Amino acid sequence: TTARDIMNAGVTCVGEHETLTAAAQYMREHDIGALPICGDDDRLHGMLTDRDIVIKGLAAGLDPNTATAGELARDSIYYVDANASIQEMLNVMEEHQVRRVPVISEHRLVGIVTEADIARHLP
Amino acid sequence: TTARDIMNAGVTCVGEHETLTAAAQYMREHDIGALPICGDDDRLHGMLTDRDIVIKGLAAGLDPNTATAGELARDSIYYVDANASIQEMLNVMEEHQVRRVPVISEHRLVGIVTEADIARHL
């Protein structure tokens, strides 16, 4: 089993220049706490979490209407290759203490894999 | 075992009129994701989470520098008495779907108990 086999494919990557307020809207829209952030051509720049917006954004004196997703997401760059094994995915999740990881193929975001996805497809 | 036995006593209740930006600063200071909010009467009004600020605040078109903790915490009221049992704490956590619960005694916030506190001291 590979990341490509269990990932949620076709997820939209939020632009690095989008504001934190805009990112907050996407999180409400999809009811999620982390968004993959990209530059041009679906190139992954990092992950932005809801807590990031509060702690690294609001609590750091940034204006959510001008501070960008990229400014905060560039602090968190982790991912797995589309051919990564379950063990590898868990390794990344463990090290970074996260429940979901971006999947990359040819430098482009191709999907997102969650810990729940792994639990569902072990057999 | 009671709530008073495993709670984090002496935590400060954030004022209902404090802004969301102020609330975020407190969450950073203590590295926590939820804050107990109290009114001018010192009575608990609710809990404000980091996600609440993002979803009920920013995503709802509110200005974090003007919207208040109290306006977002109003509909998130739950707690346990200081003499509450582990089962009671679990009932509140399960039913409200939360991991942090404020502890009250004589109508005053005396601490916060977490699921981790329970697991650790279980």
Curated annotation (Swiss-Prot), chain A:
Disulfide bonds: C13-C38
Family matches, as InterPro entries: CBS_dom, CBS_dom_sf, Diverse_CBS-Domain
The CBS domain, residue ranges: 7-64, 72-123
Highest taxon of the lineage: Bacteria
Oligomer and partners: Homodimer.
Purpose: Unlike some other CBS-domain containing proteins does not seem to bind AMP.
Protein name per Swiss-Prot or TrEMBL: Hypoxic response protein 1
Organism field: Mycobacterium tuberculosis (strain CDC 1551 / Oshkosh)
UniProtKB/Swiss-Prot annotation, chain B:
Inducers of expression: A member of the dormancy regulon. Induced in response to reduced oxygen tension (hypoxia) and low levels of nitric oxide (NO).
Matches recorded under InterPro entries: CBS_dom, CBS_dom_sf, Diverse_CBS-Domain
Residue numbers binding Zn(2+) 1: H96
Nucleotide-binding in keyword set: no
CBS domain span: 7-64, 72-122
SUPFAM superfamilies: CBS-domain pair
Gene Ontology MF: a single term: metal ion binding
Binding, Zn(2+) 2: H121
Keyword Cytoplasm part of the UniProt annotation: no
Cysteines joined through disulfide linkages: C13-C38
Record-level GO cellular component terms: extracellular region
Keywords of the record: CBS domain, Disulfide bond, Metal-binding, Repeat, Secreted, Zinc
Subcellular location, record wording: Secreted
Protein's job: Unlike some other CBS-domain containing proteins does not seem to bind AMP.
Quaternary structure, from the entry: Homodimer.
Name of the protein: Hypoxic response protein 1
